[PDB]
Amino acid sequence: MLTYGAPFNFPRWIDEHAHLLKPPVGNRQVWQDSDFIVTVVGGPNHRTDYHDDPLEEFFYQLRGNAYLNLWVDGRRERADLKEGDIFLLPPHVRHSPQRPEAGSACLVIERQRPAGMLDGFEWYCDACGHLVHRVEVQLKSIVTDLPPLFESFYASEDKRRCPHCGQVHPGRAA
Numbered sequence: 001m002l003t004y005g006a007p008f009n010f011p012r013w014i015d016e017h018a019h020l021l022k023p024p025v026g027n028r029q030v031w032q033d034s035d036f037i038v039t040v041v042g043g044p045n046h047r048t049d050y051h052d053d054p055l056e057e058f059f060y061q062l063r064g065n066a067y068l069n070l071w072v073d074g075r076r077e078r079a080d081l082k083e084g085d086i087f088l089l090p091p092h093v094r095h096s097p098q099r100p101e102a103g104s105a106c107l108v109i110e111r112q113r114p115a116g117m118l119d120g121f122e123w124y125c126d127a128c129g130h131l132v133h134r135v136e137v138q139l140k141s142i143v144t145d146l147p148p149l150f151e152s153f154y155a156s157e158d159k160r161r162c163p164h165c166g167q168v169h170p171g172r173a174a
């Protein structure tokens with residue numbers, strides 16, 4: 001059987017869900033329970049953390065512009081996803097995706113991680129640039145598995161304390 005259904009129009013699928021592709025929600029998986037994790041990610045959404053994925057992530061900016069703050073060779077870099085752009089992020093590269101624009105849409109693809117394989121999340125000192133905080137996590141369900149992790153850091157002056165210049169990372173925004 002056609003487990004994931006049959007083809008459907010994508011433009012007008014996005015439009016239908018536009019109400020979920022703007023915070024508090026922010027994103028939307030297309031199919032459930034599939035090896036390819038396929039999501040549309042919409043703005044506005046800024047975030048403070050860095051994902052460390054053990055596999056690859058594929059981006060394709062269908063609508064609006066966005067960007068990825070990165071960590072490269074020691075410096076902090078930036079990838080621009082102006083509209084129309086595609087990009088393939090290699091594994092373990094550290095990325096913080098900023099979607100300033102209201103009603104931007106970006107297709108993001110990735111693979112269900114198999115048991116044994118954990119993702120890291122990481123925040124860095126704004127000032128001394130040392131790693132403030134890191135959690136590794138067997139990512140099973142984006143929904144259930146991920147917000148709580150963010151709260152524990154965001155609601156604790158203690159974790160946000162840099163183990164170098166003792167400066168307290170903001171957690172909320174910038």
Ligand SMILES: O=C(O)c1ccccc1O
Pocket residue numbers: 041051053057095097108110
């Ligand atoms: O957890 C992810 O792979 C991810 C998904 C969408 C946007 C940014 C990301 O780091």
Ligand SMILES: [Fe+3]
Pocket residue numbers: 051052053057095
């Ligand atoms: Fe990621």
Ligand SMILES: [Fe+3]
Pocket residue numbers: 125126127128129130162163164165166167
């Ligand atoms: Fe610091």
